[PDB]
A paper describes a structure:
The biosynthesis of neurotoxin aetokthonotoxin (AETX) that features a unique structure of pentabrominated biindole nitrile involves a first-of-its-kind nitrile synthase termed AetD, an enzyme that shares very low sequence identity to known structures and catalyzes an unprecedented mechanism. AetD adopts the heme oxygenase like fold and forms a hydrophobic cavity within a helical bundle to accommodate the indole moiety. A diiron cluster comprising two irons that serves as a catalytic center binds to the carboxyl O and the amino N of the substrate. Akak et al. conducted biochemical analyses and confirmed that Fe(II) is required for AetD activity and the nitrogen atom in the nitrile is sourced from the α-amino group of the substrate instead of exogenous nitrogen or the enzyme residue.
Nonetheless, we successfully solved the structure of AetD/1 crystal that was not soaked with Fe ion. The AetD/1 structure harbors the substrate and a metal ion that is coordinated and located as the Fe1 observed in AetD/1/Fe. Based on the fact that the purified AetD carries Fe ion and the highly identical coordination status to other HO-like proteins, this metal ion should be reliably modeled with a Fe ion. Intriguingly, the Fe2-corresponding site is vacant and the Fe2-coordination networks are dissociated owing to the disordered helix α6 that deviates H179 away from the Fe2 site. Because AetD/1 and AetD/1/Fe share the same unit cell and space group, the conformational change of helix α6 is not a result of alternative crystal packing. Instead, it is possible that Fe ion in the soaking trial could bind to the enzyme and stabilize H179 to constitute the intact diiron cluster. Notably, a metal ion that is located distant from the Fe2 site and coordinated by waters, a TRIS and/or residues including E140 and H72 was observed in AetD/1. This metal was modeled with a Ni ion, whose presence could be competed by soaking crystals with Fe ion.
Author numbering:
A (entry chain A): -2 to 237
B (entry chain B): 0 to 177, 185 to 238
The structure:
């Protein structure tokens, strides 16, 4: 009934708040070079391969006969390939820097990237005892936040891609388009959710999920904002 | 009760000590530089273990008696990652590489069990009462003692041969690892807690065995990548 409807409206409310965070104002500001606006890019290293593992090992259950878990398995197979795109654009942007192994470790495990590093961990802990329909709410919330980020990042990414004549794959419109999903075959999760009735217990759990996902995503964006503030003298060094 | 749990930890420890990786690490006919080929694998574990102690085991919001003891314990164990980074440099494993090669190493499919051990412990632990979290910590510390007892053999050989202070694959680390076993022995367990404690001990030792299997496979895949320490 109007249980699911409330949950999907809560996601749109939270997306509308999330869209207005100062980090996105900065990322969208075409008066600052695109190379300066992507100086947060290396921070995603603490998230992107954790997100691959969340998809491979936490969301996925290859043995499930459950209708909803099978839809999750198809979607998370594709979403788990995007880490290679991250590493592709890391190199194009000049951020694939030579350093000591320990410097890479100290960067990823920085206290200034705690919320970035633990977002997938938090989702796995939230997700551990959820039935597949409730896992679909986690994924839909996480993917809604992710689409806001990549719709913003693709703005300077596409400006650099065009200017350098280089194919960007992660901070790129192609990432946003394949992530959204508009292909013949298996339905989008949002289509399934639109057609599913929530019990009162499921509705309270779904509100908790949506509030947590958006809080943890906001915590991650806060760390990107403080990293940028500490590096405005620095820029991406793409070559043509 | 607790009697049966501490006996099972001893049993599991006895079986763990026998894995082929430990036979290799203890083999003094192999150079200690070759036996520590597995050292860099620990990169996928050691900083995750710092975070497990800081963020998962620790709860600075709680006033319960057991959680207060855990908290103190987690304050010591959260320091050992710096010792890992110290010995990385001394062994010649703090290699200059591309940022992407560091990431591809840690997130290697060949270090999946190593990388996910602390994640697995956090998920196991997140809804346990403090006394049951103590069981997780004691099991995990018992498996860690078997490993560092073994690694400290080739470690201390290199430390003496080079006159450098090793801190992670070293007797000092083993000695600090050896209050919580004490109050576990003087604690009453319901039948519910007893059954959960058995499950915790079996998972911790299964996950640790999976990590040790990856270290063994790594050594065999990288037989030319021996440590390159230097004398002071
Ligand atoms: N589409 C992203 C996944 C994603 C989904 N949600 C995300 C959030 Br919240 C923050 C960051 Br950074 C990334 C994401 C990817 O391919 O890594
Ligand atoms: N692109 C479509 C679904 C779709 C995606 N690719 C398509 C191709 Br190629 C052929 C045909 Br007919 C349909 C499609 C969409 O977004 O509406
Ligand atoms: N004493 C270890 C902690 C430890 C505790 N248990 C461990 C296991 Br199982 C595997 C490995 Br590698 C390490 C540990 C440390 O300080 O990093
Ligand atoms: Fe993606
Ligand atoms: Fe330790
Ligand atoms: Ni999809
Ligand atoms: Ni389409
Ligand atoms: Ni739980
Ligand atoms: Ni300890
Ligand atoms: Ni290798």
């Amino acid at each position: 009934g109007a249980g699911m409807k409330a949950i999907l409206q809560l996601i749109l409310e939270k997306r509308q708040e999330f869209e207005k965070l100062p980090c996105f104002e900065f990322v969208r500001d075409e008066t600052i070079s695109p190379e300066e606006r992507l100086i947060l890019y290396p921070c995603i290293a603490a998230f992107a391969l954790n997100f691959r593992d969340l998809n491979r090992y936490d969301y996925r259950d290859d043995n499930s006969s459950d209708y909803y878990q099978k839809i999750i398995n198809i979607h998370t197979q594709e979403d788990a390939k995007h880490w290679e795109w991250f590493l592709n654009d890391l190199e194009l942007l000049g951020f694939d820097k030579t350093m000591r192994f320990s410097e890479a470790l100290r960067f990823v495990w920085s206290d200034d990237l705690l919320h970035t590093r633990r977002l997938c961990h938090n989702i796995a802990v939230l997700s551990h005892d959820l039935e597949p329909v409730m896992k679909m709410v986690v994924i839909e919330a996480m993917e809604t936040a992710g689409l806001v980020i990549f719709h913003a990042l693709a703005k300077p990414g596409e400006s650099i891609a065009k200017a350098t004549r280089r194919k960007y794959l992660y901070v790129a419109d192609s990432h946003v388009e394949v992530e959204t999903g508009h292909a013949v075959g298996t339905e989008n999760i949002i289509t399934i959710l639109e057609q599913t009735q929530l019990s009162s217990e499921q509705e309270e759990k779904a509100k908790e999920i949506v509030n947590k996902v958006f809080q943890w995503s906001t915590n991650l964006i806060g760390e990107f904002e403080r990293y940028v503030k500490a590096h405005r003298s620095e820029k991406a060094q793409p070559t043509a």
